[PDB]
């Protein structure tokens with residue numbers, strides 16, 4: 001029960017993490033990363049969803065990161081972009097006075113794997129002489145288990161209706177086409193059968 005910063009995006013996962021963090025700590029603030037798009041539906045939904053439950057939100061533009069993109073160095077993939085996110089989130093946690101850094105990451109990409117988040121935690125700590133603790137509450141949970149959690153927090157429906165998962169700005173049960181939707185839906189259904 002101290003101060004916590006949640007890397008928030010408004011998706012099923014970061015939202016569940018926030019709800020989670022809200023019950024674990026006294027103070028909880030959020031951070032949303034955008035690539036120069038205060039107007040994006042994702043950044044907006046997130047700000048909405050944040051309001052809905054107190055918690056200050058901080059926006060951060062990470063478009064400078066795109067300098068490292070292949071095209072800019074003369075493909076749009078930039079490796080270890082999660083290193084930077086957690087790096088920044090921890091610089092922020094420092095200023096804002098939080099010791100805890102919640103994130104929805106969960107092993108795919110090497111910088112989403114559990115050992116990387118651990119090495120990263122050590123690094124930020126040495127970088128700033130602060131006992132920072134990075135929490136990855138969804139690390140060993142699958143989609144259906146992520147719903148299961150939300151539900152154990154009593155926010156199943158909140159999450160179901162407000163978060164943005166679809167790859168087309170369509171809130172909740174988006175297009176019902178894209179991967180995201182299928183994965184989110186199959187997870188939901190899988191959790192319902194294990195009712």
Ligand SMILES: [Mg+2]
Nearest residue numbers: 011012013014
């Ligand atoms: Mg998310």
Ligand SMILES: [Zn+2]
Nearest residue numbers: 166167174175
């Ligand atoms: Zn979709």
